[PDB]
RNA sequence: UAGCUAGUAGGUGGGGUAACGGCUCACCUAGGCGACGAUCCCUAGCUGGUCUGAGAGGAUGACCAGCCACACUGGAACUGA
RNA sequence: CCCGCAGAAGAAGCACCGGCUAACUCCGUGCCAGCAGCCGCGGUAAUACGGAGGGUGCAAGCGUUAAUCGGAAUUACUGGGCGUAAAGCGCACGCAGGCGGUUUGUUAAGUCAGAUGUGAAAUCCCCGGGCUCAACCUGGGAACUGCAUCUGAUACUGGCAA
């Protein structure tokens, strides 16, 4: 269950006695397409080596997401650094209407149709963490039922 | 019933006429906060019945001057 | 109003076979398909996220023979209609008369079907229709008029339609050039290759 | 901030000034033209950029850039002005429309000829 | 004088008349009290052609309203027992 | 200087849950008990009392399911600086109807779910996720 | 733009108005408006709507429809429902 | 609107092709000539200038200009901030104003519920119908987020007595 993909690649510099040496930073997200997501950063001297190094981290750094059918449970914020991020569940129609970086993480997670918007800064690294902070936080009705110790139907209905 | 309006008097020093503020607690269109807005009418009264600083009931009627289309109905709670 | 240029050129740029120059012969093998869009055909494209959406839109346009102004109007109808926006886009395209006339087998190509519709040959529910864009409603009976019936272009073009998949949603008589459009086309019946999701993405932004 | 403060003084909307004072939302405007001349641009560029002062019909006195290679503009000659900064000559914030009125088309042009006002070959 | 007359809407060469209760001084298309059915001369034999709410006509003609030359013909067209 | 007492209650609940604290003492009231009972009845709080005659001290007893606290988020909506009264149909639903909004209606204080079915609106006191 | 205001603010009586009224007079009282923006200045026909927007809003008020205003510029009345 | 000939005959442009943004080479020129919506291209091997070929995008239109909103959560009510980025008055007192601990009353101003009248027609929206189709016209519905009055509800906020 791969469904791996690349959000952004970006070259970064160091500067030393001689001149300045350039490495590359990848940013990949992976998921099964059924409530499992994992971003992995990864950096290296060469570009294709950086994306493997990222993909290896992305597989291990995985988070579970309890989601309804093919969409979110409830509207959710998920702040991180300078990226606010908001995303609403939406109905069985439509598709993923969200920004790049924010919609790579959503489509591989397995949400088929959501509203979304990145406020604040839209740095690819931080907006991907912002989403995963949101999707980790996002609780389901089965969790909330057991949390209070009441009933699944009495809460929902 | 007759369409009256309650209100507190601001002044009565005009001879057979009285000015009355109607405090209306409407909310702000944009910002949602409830503001304490005022409406100063001129009102007719037979003799100097009502003084300064007291609640008064007022009715809409015929225009009887330049301004002053409202008219007194009765007094409720006199001046302190 | 129409393309009227090199039609097999459009298929190499897109990659897949668009049925533009399907015609009498079954398979082409006469253009270096896939690996020669133009002069710089050997150039492997990077192909961005906006690219793949545009390539998918332009494919569905060039197959059905529709321009962007009229195509974007189908999207505006598709959004307002019920169900799924993606499934409606393609359902409205398949409901065109020039497309139905092609799918019945009264035209080797869709452009030939378009010309057949436009030149007073096609007739539906006892009424002549010139418009390729004519939205064919459920439960109709498209047919050819008796003056232009059994002309040289239609009889040869109907023999081609035996090799074709032949839709389930419509039925053809084949003897007297008489068709019967029955129900609205389903997603799973046709194509199973052109992606709708990417075209919905292009227009939503 | 503070909802009471906003009731007392509402949100003042930033009235962003227009780039091009040609006035009354006009697409283009006539210009009598005075002093056709060359000028040097800012730092990384270096050239002799062709430009003219334009006595506009409404009363304004603006510089306008003369696009294309070569021109018929001199001393007077009535021209048409559209909007658009050059971003190189500081002060120049308009473009002469090539083709309209006494400003002729660019000589011997093939590609992009609506811009530069040239007819078919 | 209130009068029941046609309003004339629809496209060029394709008229559609909104029969309507209006004051004589007000323009054809302009101000009215209330619309009271319609008329379509280019309808032909099909489902719909002409409709005219006869209950509201009793409220106006009974009180004091004239009926125009064409609207008087459509009250004869709709009939009382035909 | 102590303008909203109800917000102060909801901070003590929020800040008690952050500190992993068992019980939360505070000055009592009519409206405090009404809110505290609605939170208990649905199941954010696990029991409470109102011990005191002259100077009453309402103490709550906060709930914890895992290491995580039960009250995820709790905020004042209809603060005294800006009163927020919603109508029957315009009543909110917190977390798409799996959290609650405490709403002071004409038939006493109750949840937003109960206010819909009872058929009336009111002052929305606080959202509770 | 911080004070404006003397038929100005109210009363009694007379005249006038299709109609009530400082509408207008005579006398009487000394008010009235004003920081929840009077006065002064600049700009502007107003609405149903239009365009835009996830919506809140923002902008706008060509065409169709309602209301107002004006008719060479400044006045006045006559005629008449 | 319908047939009747006639012959492909009379009927295709114009943006763009360095990143943003779909599409590349070759000559000419050499911080010149010029381009430019933003970054920026040109100093003798230019994908950005001029031409040529080739492509891409729209097509009886296409681009440029101007104008409004959007994106702009860049006036933030929904929905921002103020240690160092722009931003806590130098510090107090204080009238008007905003806000106000707690328990009983009691009204019903706010608030909430219901009901009736109205919110012109068109427009918008949905299901139809009519022009060969569409735009266009058009039937009915919903809506017109409102305002008024009238009857209740008393938790909350206000008024009022302790
Ligand atoms: Mg060292
Ligand atoms: Mg920013
Ligand atoms: Mg009453
Ligand atoms: Mg009342
Ligand atoms: Mg056209
Ligand atoms: Mg050919
Ligand atoms: Mg959109
Ligand atoms: Mg220089
Ligand atoms: Mg009139
Ligand atoms: Mg007839
Ligand atoms: Mg209501
Ligand atoms: Mg008269
Ligand atoms: Mg008067
Ligand atoms: Mg809209
Ligand atoms: Mg929109
Ligand atoms: Mg917005
Ligand atoms: Mg306006
Ligand atoms: Mg006009
Ligand atoms: Mg006209
Ligand atoms: Mg007119
Ligand atoms: Mg009037
Ligand atoms: Mg008037
Ligand atoms: Mg006049
Ligand atoms: Mg007049
Ligand atoms: Mg005139
Ligand atoms: Mg005159
Ligand atoms: Mg005159
Ligand atoms: Mg005059
Ligand atoms: Mg007479
Ligand atoms: Mg003909
Ligand atoms: Mg012929
Ligand atoms: Mg021939
Ligand atoms: Mg022949
Ligand atoms: Mg030709
Ligand atoms: Mg030189
Ligand atoms: Mg070089
Ligand atoms: Mg070269
Ligand atoms: Mg070029
Ligand atoms: Mg070309
Ligand atoms: Mg244009
Ligand atoms: Mg803007
Ligand atoms: Mg904004
Ligand atoms: Mg705010
Ligand atoms: Mg900020
Ligand atoms: Mg500094
Ligand atoms: Mg600072
Ligand atoms: Mg300070
Ligand atoms: Mg200080
Ligand atoms: Mg200050
Ligand atoms: Mg005070
Ligand atoms: Mg107070
Ligand atoms: Mg209190
Ligand atoms: Mg209290
Ligand atoms: Mg009572
Ligand atoms: Mg009330
Ligand atoms: Mg009210
Ligand atoms: Mg009500
Ligand atoms: Mg209406
Ligand atoms: Mg329709
Ligand atoms: Mg039809
Ligand atoms: Mg139809
Ligand atoms: Mg229309
Ligand atoms: Mg209609
Ligand atoms: Mg209607
Ligand atoms: Mg209704
Ligand atoms: Mg009681
Ligand atoms: Mg009470
Ligand atoms: Mg009370």
From Swiss-Prot, chain A:
Oligomer and partners: Part of the 30S ribosomal subunit. Contacts proteins uS4 and uS8. With proteins uS4 and uS5 encircles the mRNA as it enters the ribosome, which may play a role in mRNA helicase processivity. Can be cross-linked to mRNA. In collided ribosomes contacts ribosome rescue factor SmrB.
Any Pfam family the entry gives: Ribosomal_S5_C
Keyword terms, alphabetized: Acetylation, Antibiotic resistance, Ribonucleoprotein, Ribosomal protein, RNA-binding, rRNA-binding
GO molecular function: rRNA binding; structural constituent of ribosome
GO-annotated biological processes: cytoplasmic translation; maintenance of translational fidelity; response to antibiotic; ribosomal small subunit assembly; translation
Similarity comment: family membership: Belongs to the universal ribosomal protein uS5 family.
Database matches in InterPro entries: Ribosomal_Su5_D2-typ_SF, Ribosomal_uS5, Ribosomal_uS5_bac-type, Ribosomal_uS5_C, Ribosomal_uS5_N, Ribosomal_uS5_N_CS, Ribsml_uS5_D2-typ_fold_subgr
Domain notes from UniProt: The N-terminal domain interacts with the head of the 30S subunit; the C-terminal domain interacts with the body and contacts protein uS4. The interaction surface between uS4 and uS5 is involved in control of translational fidelity.
UniProt source species: Escherichia coli (strain K12)
Annotated effect of mutating residue 103 to S: In strain: NEA-319; neamycin resistant
Domain S5 DRBM residues, every copy: 2-65
Gene Ontology CC annotations of this record: cytoplasm; cytosol; cytosolic small ribosomal subunit
Keyword match Lipid biosynthesis: no
Listed name of the protein: Small ribosomal subunit protein uS5
Signal peptide, first to last residue: none
Swiss-Prot record, chain B:
A single GO cellular-component term on record: cytoplasm
Gene3D superfamilies in UniProt: Nucleic acid-binding proteins (2.40.50.140)
Keyword rRNA-binding assigned: yes
Alphabetical list of InterPro entries matching this protein: NA-bd_OB-fold, Ribosomal_uS17, Ribosomal_uS17_bact/chlr, Ribosomal_uS17_CS
The keyword Ribosomal protein is assigned to this record: yes
Effect of residue 28 to P: In neamine-resistant mutant nea301
Entry keywords, A to Z: Antibiotic resistance, Ribonucleoprotein, Ribosomal protein, RNA-binding, rRNA-binding
UniProt GO MF annotations: rRNA binding; small ribosomal subunit rRNA binding; structural constituent of ribosome; zinc ion binding
Additional remark text: The strain missing both S17 and L29 grows very slowly and has a rather unstable temperature-sensitive phenotype.
Complex and partners: Part of the 30S ribosomal subunit.
Matches recorded under HAMAP family: Ribosomal_uS17_B (MF_01345_B)
Function: One of the primary rRNA binding proteins, it binds specifically to the 5'-end of 16S ribosomal RNA. Also plays a role in translational accuracy; neamine-resistant ribosomes show reduced neamine-induced misreading in vitro.
Family: Belongs to the universal ribosomal protein uS17 family.
Protein name: Small ribosomal subunit protein uS17
Protein species of origin: Escherichia coli (strain K12)
Swiss-Prot record, chain D:
Span of the signal peptide: none
More about this protein: At least 19 substitutions or deletions in 11 codons can promote streptomycin resistance, dependence or pseudodependence; all but one of the streptomycin resistant mutations (K42R) are associated with hyperaccurate translation and thus reduced translational efficiency.
GO biological processes: cytoplasmic translation; Group I intron splicing; maintenance of translational fidelity; positive regulation of RNA splicing; response to antibiotic; RNA folding; translation
Annotated InterPro entries: NA-bd_OB-fold, Ribosomal_uS12, Ribosomal_uS12_bac
One of the record's GO molecular function terms: rRNA binding
Keyword match Metal-binding: no
Residues carrying 3-methylthioaspartic acid: 88
Role this protein plays: With S4 and S5 plays an important role in translational accuracy. Interacts with and stabilizes bases of the 16S rRNA that are involved in tRNA selection in the A site and with the mRNA backbone. Located at the interface of the 30S and 50S subunits, it traverses the body of the 30S subunit contacting proteins on the other side and probably holding the rRNA structure together. The combined cluster of proteins S8, S12 and S17 appears to hold together the shoulder and platform of the 30S subunit.
Keywords: Acetylation, Antibiotic resistance, Methylation, Ribonucleoprotein, Ribosomal protein, RNA-binding, rRNA-binding, tRNA-binding
GO cellular component: cytoplasm; cytosol; cytosolic small ribosomal subunit; ribosome
Protein name: Small ribosomal subunit protein uS12
Residue positions, PTM N6-acetyllysine: 107
Swiss-Prot record, chain F:
Alphabetically ordered keywords of this record: Repressor, Ribonucleoprotein, Ribosomal protein, RNA-binding, rRNA-binding, Translation regulation
GO cellular component: cytoplasm; cytosol; cytosolic small ribosomal subunit
Pfam families per UniProt: Ribosomal_S8
Gene3D superfamilies, per the entry: 3.30.1370.30, 3.30.1490.10
GO biological process, one term: regulation of mRNA stability
Cysteines paired by S-S bonds: none
Cited PROSITE patterns: RIBOSOMAL_S8 (PS00053)
InterPro entries: Ribosomal_uS8 (IPR000630), Ribosomal_uS8_CS (IPR047863), Ribosomal_uS8_sf (IPR035987)
GO MF terms, alphabetically ordered: rRNA binding; structural constituent of ribosome
UniProt superkingdom: Bacteria
Classification via PANTHER family: 40S RIBOSOMAL PROTEIN S15A
Oligomer and partners: Part of the 30S ribosomal subunit. Contacts proteins S5 and S12.
Family: Belongs to the universal ribosomal protein uS8 family.
NCBIfam families: PRK00136.1
Function: One of the primary rRNA binding proteins, it binds directly to 16S rRNA central domain where it helps coordinate assembly of the platform of the 30S subunit.
Name of the protein this chain belongs to: Small ribosomal subunit protein uS8
Organism: Escherichia coli (strain K12)
Encoding gene per record: rpsH
């Amino acid at each position: 269950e791969l469904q791996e993909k690349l959000i952004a690649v970006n070259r970064v510099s160091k500067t030393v006695k001689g001149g300045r040496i350039f490495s590359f930073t990848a940013l990949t997200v992976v998921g099964d397409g059924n409530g499992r997501v994992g971003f992995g950063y990864g950096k290296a001297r060469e570009v294709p080596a950086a994306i493997q190094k990222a993909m290896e981290k992305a597989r291990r750094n995985m988070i579970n997401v309890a989601l309804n059918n093919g969409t979110l449970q409830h509207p959710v914020k998920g702040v991180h650094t300078g990226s606010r991020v908001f995303m609403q569940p939406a109905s069985e129609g439509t598709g993923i209407i969200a920004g790049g970086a924010m919609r790579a993480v959503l489509e591989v997670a397995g949400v088929h149709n959501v509203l979304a918007k990145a406020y604040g800064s839209t740095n690819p690294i931080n907006v991907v963490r912002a989403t995963i902070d949101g999707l980790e936080n996002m609780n389901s009705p089965e969790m909330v039922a057991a949390k209070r110790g009441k009933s699944v139907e009495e809460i929902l209905g | 019933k007759i369409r009256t309006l309650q209100g507190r008097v601001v002044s009565d020093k005009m001879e057979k006429s009285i000015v009355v503020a109607i405090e209306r607690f409407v909310k702000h269109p944009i910002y949602g906060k409830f503001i304490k807005r005022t409406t100063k009418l001129h009102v007719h009264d037979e003799n100097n019945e009502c003084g300064i600083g007291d609640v008064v009931e007022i009715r809409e009627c015929r225009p009887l001057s330049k301004t002053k289309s409202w008219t007194l109905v009765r007094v409720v709670e006199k001046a302190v | 109003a129409r393309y009227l240029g090199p039609k097999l050129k459009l298929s190499r740029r897109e990659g897949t076979d668009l049925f533009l120059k399907s015609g009498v012969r079954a398979i082409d093998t006469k253009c270096k398909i896939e690996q020669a869009p133009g002069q710089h055909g050997a150039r492997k494209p990077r192909l961005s996220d906006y690219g793949v959406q545009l390539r998918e839109k332009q494919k569905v346009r060039r197959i059905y023979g529709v321009l962007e102004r009229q195509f974007r109007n189908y999207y505006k109808e598709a959004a307002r209609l019920k169900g799924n926006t993606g499934e409606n886009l393609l359902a409205l395209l398949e409901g065109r008369l020039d497309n139905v006339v092609y799918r019945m087998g009264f035209g080797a190509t869709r452009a030939e079907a378009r010309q057949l519709v436009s030149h007073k040959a096609i007739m539906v529910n006892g009424r002549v229709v010139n418009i390729a864009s004519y939205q064919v409603s459920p439960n109709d009976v498209v047919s050819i008029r008796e003056k232009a019936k059994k002309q040289s272009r239609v009889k040869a073009a109907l023999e081609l339609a035996e090799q074709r998949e032949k839709p389930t949603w419509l039925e053809v008589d084949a003897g007297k050039m008489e068709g019967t459009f029955k129900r609205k086309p389903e997603r799973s019946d046709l194509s199973a290759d052109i992606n709708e999701h990417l075209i919905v993405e292009l227009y939503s932004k | 901030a503070t909802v009471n403060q906003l009731v007392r003084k509402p949100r003042a909307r930033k009235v962003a000034k227009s780039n091009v004072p040609a006035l009354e939302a006009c697409p283009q405007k006539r210009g009598v033209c005075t002093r056709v001349y060359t000028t040097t641009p800012k730092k990384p560029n270096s050239a002799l950029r062709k430009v003219c002062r334009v006595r506009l019909t409404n009363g304004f006195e603006v510089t306008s850039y003369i696009g294309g290679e070569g021109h018929n503009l001199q001393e007077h000659s009535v021209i048409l002005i559209r909007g658009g900064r050059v971003k190189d000559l500081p002060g120049v914030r308009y473009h002469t429309v090539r083709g309209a009125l006494d400003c002729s088309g660019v000589k011997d042009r093939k590609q992009a000829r609506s811009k530069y006002g040239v007819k078919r070959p | 004088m209130v009068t029941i007359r046609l309003a004339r809407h629809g496209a060029k060469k394709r008229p559609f008349y909104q029969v309507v209760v209006a004051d004589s001084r007000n323009a054809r298309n302009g101000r009215f009290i209330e619309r009271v059915g319609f008329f379509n001369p280019i309808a032909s034999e099909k489902e719909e052609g002409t409709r005219l709410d006869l209950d509201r006509i009793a409220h106006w003609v009974g009180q004091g309203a004239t009926i125009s030359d064409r609207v008087a013909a459509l009250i004869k067209e709709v009939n009382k027992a035909a | 200087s102590m303008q909203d007492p109800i917000a102060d209650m909801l901070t003590r609940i929020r800040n008690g849950q952050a500190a992993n604290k068992a019980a939360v003492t505070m000055p009592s009231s009519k409206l405090k008990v009404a809110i505290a009972n609605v939170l208990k009845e649905e199941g954010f709080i696990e029991d409470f009392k109102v011990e005191g005659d002259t100077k009453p001290e309402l103490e709550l007893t906060l709930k914890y399911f895992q290491g995580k606290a039960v009250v995820e988020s709790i905020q004042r909506v209809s603060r005294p600086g800006l009163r927020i009264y919603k109508r029957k149909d315009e009543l909110p639903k917190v977390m798409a109807g799996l959290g609650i909004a405490v709403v002071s209606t004409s038939k006493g204080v109750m949840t937003d779910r109960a206010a819909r079915q009872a058929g009336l609106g009111g002052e929305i006191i606080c959202y509770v996720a």
